[model samples]
Target: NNLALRAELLATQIREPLNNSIGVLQSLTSIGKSAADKEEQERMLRSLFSVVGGVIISGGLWPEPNLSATDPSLRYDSLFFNKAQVDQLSSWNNPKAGGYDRESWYLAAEREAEGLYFWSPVYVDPYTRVEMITVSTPYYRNGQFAGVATVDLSLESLIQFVAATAEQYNLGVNLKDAFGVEVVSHNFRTYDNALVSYYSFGEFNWQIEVVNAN
Candidate 1:
């Protein structure tokens, strides 16, 4: 059980900060409800996104026009990406051009049941231009689906965390998404003699396989 214990410890360490970032998204739906207008809500989300100072590189809320309390005419996208790196991703800066509605995260979260989260496959972020993943959930208004609130996490940071956490146990880490796609790793070799741990967070199903590095 030594390897199993070490794997669980490393996975827990890696998942902790991620959980906090996801919590940031959860609080958004709560605070968003208080905004009286679309602009107000967008401003609020932007303000909150600014203060996060974490791996969460973006925060956005896109409405389901028909169910939203705000006028459908005012229904422009309120998605927010990291403005510090704004110039780096001019291509998607204009929400219209990015086709907010056409995104996988948006489409998935739109139909996702309330109170549950939808985790997107790893994608290269247009803003940060790095590997990242999004966690989102359907937000409701008056007990009906209204929009999706989402935030993006930098996988690079997660990889660093994995390396650091595994180092303590003289282990190497291989982190993978639901489909066994490698998200990140550190000194990880073959899975032949590795210890494996599985995690289901929100709608994400991920695997952590660890092996001795030395």
Candidate 2:
């Protein structure tokens, strides 16, 4: 019970923040507008940085017709900071720097899906070089999918905590995607023989799985 309780503690840290961020983002004013047009964008981001732990994403404000048409960071409106590693003012959509300005616009599927989404690992942090996963949702304006809000998590960072938790319970843990492919695994050698336990931490792209080896 002690081990399971501790695992629950960390799992809440991972789960609630992203979901909390979703609520905050949806409630924020002037979400689909440029930072210059309304200061709310910057203020909300700052609040997230302070309260939600280190997070960064391809946040944008450029409406269709693609706004400025230059400076992917500026034209499309991208400001990101990763407090755990480094703070970046902009990436300008450089391939090496990772996701460009317009890329945020393209990838905001929650906007179209009209709900929260868990994206499989794709983005790479320019500073940390760790593959990242995202839990994101859309923000609407006048009932339109104007912009998106996202919370980023590094797979490398998550694995350590997840693995430790699984081992403590003498369980095998699997963070598996929709296709049943394991994004990461703990105690895999025992999973085949163990009774599996499942959980839902909000997003459905990958549901949490635990193995009862006993």
Candidate 3:
């Protein structure tokens, strides 16, 4: 009950601001869709990313250190891929098995799902091995799914937040992914030893496991 309470409290605090930012960004993005001028649309897109990044970092949801700067370049390009790369990747399907392209995964599942947003637990970056959470929002243009705006939040922030909360309450908290993958924690080193479960709230998936070492 204590772990659930803590998880609920943290989720409530983070979700409110996170949803607010998503609403504002979606509004701006919708306006950009109606604009005829290409340059104006581009400006609005930039604003969308800037605001999203600001919201994530300012709300303390992003765990990355040194995120004080809100550079548009920090945003992931949903349309990243050369013709050859796209051609090669497009031939493959089935993301669950791991051959599908990451960009395509967001566009097809998150964006096409319509107004749906998805969040993944902080993972060691496949390349950098740094802890990070990948959050994506579906975007629409002309009543059609345009693409998803995705961002990565450093895991350091989340880890630090959980640590502070644990210290304050004298309780341990562990956050996990839908697949029961341990994201961050002060307890449990292996998935076999950690609690594995799923909590589904609407389209969102979250898993929290806590162990008291005391």
Candidate 4:
């Protein structure tokens, strides 16, 4: 249970802040509904992204456009990355042209709406310029499902943690994604990888396999 204990600790470290930011942004959405001005709503969003800490390379919303009452720019304009970082939504996030008509954003939005949780495969992050995975959570407004709030966590951080944990304890370790993809394995020496202790954690099914080479 040691690797589970440690990896769970590491995973929850990311998960806790994500849950907190989700709560914060969800409340911002509530406050934004009556925020008095578009600028104020954006100000709250910028602050939420800033407050979430650096591990989160960026944060954004996928709003419900045709809500009964809505702000025009917010309803019409599709995406918001950290204003300090980009002039536009990152190149990869293509919201539909006219409005939130129909596209992939809603897939992530609806997926989060179902369980308030989802994880993306590793992808290049424009903001951080690193391979990253996203943690998506549901953000609601006035009891209506508004959008998904997302935070991209660096895969580098996780790899570094696993590596350091392996060496610090003189053990060989391997981590695999949900589909059994090998992410990183360490300190194998000449031992049988098959002899390693195996474990799984997080909803995305990250599997950790470890070998005590010491």
Candidate 5:
């Protein structure tokens, strides 16, 4: 109960700040061209860029903490595992562990799907040995493909939430994709296993997966 409450509180706090920041960004971006003189327009543009630059810097969006690009620290800390580890674990040709590869699945399903979003179940972290879920969305600007935005959520938090909710009423929850593959499970061995159960979003060439405890 306490864990669920804490997670909800933290989520609310984080979301409020994010909402305020986004509102500020929208206002800055809305500085009209015709409403301002040439000098004023230039000043507005510069001010807008300055605000955006500050947001990117403070939010770790670019240069130092570029979340779009790959970073070992961010991946491990947020997703509970690094890209290298995910790659290694998803190897299909390896004689030791032969199966469908995640990279292959990502590539095959990424460009073909439409209007769908990909979601993953809880993934087990090799380093911390914790379960987590990573959700990623495709980035597009003016109908052009940009990148992927990924968010990691702890599975333990979800479990605690479910348990807490269960105590209040008769509640049942199940997660799956269009293919009817279960995304969330009490027992899942690998990240690959968790990913195979989710729907593919073709707009974004990104893979989202979650692995639970063994």
Candidate 6:
């Protein structure tokens, strides 16, 4: 019961934040359908970011026109915010950064069926040097794939919470992938399998193993 309870605690804390981000991405799809152009879409994104800025690190709408060979008029309007400032930015067709449309997150969403979303593997944000995960969903226009709406979610706070709570419970925590590669841990060490409480989170399904601190 203790193991399951800790897993539930972490999952519950994550649920609302994940849902809020997904909700925003879906809503952006609706806005994209009727927005005049990339500029207009970006303006909408900025406004929404103001309110939902705490959980979300950054967000963008990368349209088909921008991803494909671009025209001068259709500029890439994706914005990546570090804190409240636009410190990092990328274009789908940037010659310097190469093409970002081919990146895993974009392709994952691109290949997904309409109305579906994707959760990316955890990666460190180059600009912020913070571990981050991206949630991406594809948007279609008139039955055709239009673009992807993606948000970068911060894991810093969540990791801290896990560590603090594990300490409070006098338990060591190990968060890892299915292959047993640890992603995050606190006061953890290898111990008897039967003594460890194993759990998992949604979507990513990363394993959470807990054991007595002693």
Cα TM-score per model: 0.79, 0.64, 0.54, 0.64, 0.33, 0.76
| TM-score attained by model 3 | 0.54
User: Regarding lDDT, does 2 or 3 come out ahead?
Assistant: 2
lDDT of 2 by residue, 33-87 (tens): 3334535655555555555543333232323324445555434445454555334
Show the colliding residue pairs in model 1: none
lDDT of 5 by residue, 151-184 (tens): 3345555555543443333222233433444433
Worst 10 residues of 6 by lDDT: 86-95
The reply for model 5, stretches above 4 Å from the true place, is 1-115, 125-129, 170-214
Local error of candidate 4 at residue 207 (angstroms) = 1.4
lDDT of 4 by residue, 1-214 (tens): 3644544444444344346545654554454345345566566666666666544556566555553334534444434564244333533333233443243334555634434556566777544466766666565556666565565665676667667766766567777775567766777544454354556676465666666555
What overall lDDT goes with each candidate model? Answer: 0.69, 0.52, 0.45, 0.55, 0.33, 0.67
Instruction: Look at candidate 4 and tell me the lDDT of residue 166.
Output: 67
What is the Å distance of residue 213 in model 6 from its true position? 4.1
In model 3, state the lDDT of residue 120.
58
Mind giving the per-residue lDDT tens digits that candidate 1 earns over 3-90?
A: 7777777877877757866788887877655545856765666677767765676667766643243553343445565645332122
Residue pairs clashing in model 6 are none
In model 2, the number of clashes is 1
Comparing candidate 3 with candidate 6, which one achieves the higher lDDT? 6
The regions of model 3 sitting more than 4 angstroms off are: 1-7, 14-32, 36-38, 45-111, 120-131, 187-204, 211-214
Supply candidate 1's per-residue lDDT for 182.
88
Clashes of each: 0, 1, 1, 0, 6, 0
